[PDB]
Amino acid sequence: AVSFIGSTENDVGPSLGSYSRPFVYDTRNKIGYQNANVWHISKGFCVGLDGKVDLPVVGSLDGQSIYGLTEEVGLLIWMGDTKYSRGTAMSGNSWENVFSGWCVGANTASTQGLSVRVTPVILKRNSSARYSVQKTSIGSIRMRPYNGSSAGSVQTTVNFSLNPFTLN
């Protein structure tokens, strides 16, 4: 079996967080969303995750996209399984496999979770040397059943919004 237990709409990072330091900020996991329990799965269900970024691609760095927010500021983005170190670096605007997946035991119950993580990038330095960003939609993640498993009419997709932040 499978059922949806998480939230449909999800905020990434603390509201009006401020960060100091193309220039890439070391924000670690601060601008993130993580939830180990988004679908409940049981009895042989096999599942992975696809991710999709809806932001415009404005550049690239070491093989992944820089996604644009304003003219000063963009983002590097990772999506994946629950633990942050399993994040897949995102490129383009198509659905991408961001977790190869696993299968719960034939006689057990568990959960499937996810994570989204971003790091701010200064694309063009201003004169203000402080930069604000407002609440913006990032994209989505859907579960991907496999091995013949079926979602039935269970909700497959959840969405992410970047909370506003300031760069110093």
Ligand SMILES: CC(=O)N[C@H]1[C@H](Oc2ccc([N+](=O)[O-])cc2)O[C@H](CO)[C@@H](O)[C@@H]1O
């Ligand atoms: C920790 C938890 O409640 N569920 C996690 C789940 O944790 C597991 C707990 C037990 C086993 N097990 O084989 O005994 C496997 C994963 O693993 C999934 C895939 O990595 C995660 O998406 C999910 O968040």
